[PDB]
Amino acid sequence: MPHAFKPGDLVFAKMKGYPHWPARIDDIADGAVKPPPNKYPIFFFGTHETAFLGPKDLFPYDKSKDKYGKPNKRKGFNEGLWEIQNNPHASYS
Numbered sequence: 308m309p310h311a312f313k314p315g316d317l318v319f320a321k322m323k324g325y326p327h328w329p330a331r332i333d334d335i336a337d338g339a340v341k342p343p344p345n346k347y348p349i350f351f352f353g354t355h356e357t358a359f360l361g362p363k364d365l366f367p368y369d370k371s372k373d374k375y376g377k378p379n380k381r382k383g384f385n386e387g388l389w390e391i392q393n394n395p396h397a398s399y400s
């Protein structure tokens with residue numbers, strides 16, 4: 308059965324106006340800004356941006372990749388597909 312989300316989990320993450328996007332749950336570094344309650348820090352592959360999202364917008368990657376993991380015209384998306392498949396746990400700073 309499923310656990311709660313934890314840092315390192317791979318997802319497609321949904322935000323208003325964008326396609327379901329390759330992303331990971333991030334850790335919060337010591338001394339860095341924490342997310343609001345009930346929100347997770349989501350690192351978006353390709354764009355390398357971070358937003359705070361709750362589980363309603365987080366789709367586990369294994370289950371969802373058949374539907375959401377196809378090339379898209381949006382800036383950063385196809386780079387993001389490469390990252391989530393080939394080196395999802397790397398430093399992208």
Ligand SMILES: CCC(=O)NCc1nnc2n1CCCC2
Nearest residue numbers: 322325328351354356357358383
């Ligand atoms: C998250 C930061 C933001 O609002 N910038 C717009 C934006 N541009 N590409 C993306 N995003 C959002 C999430 C999918 C990747």
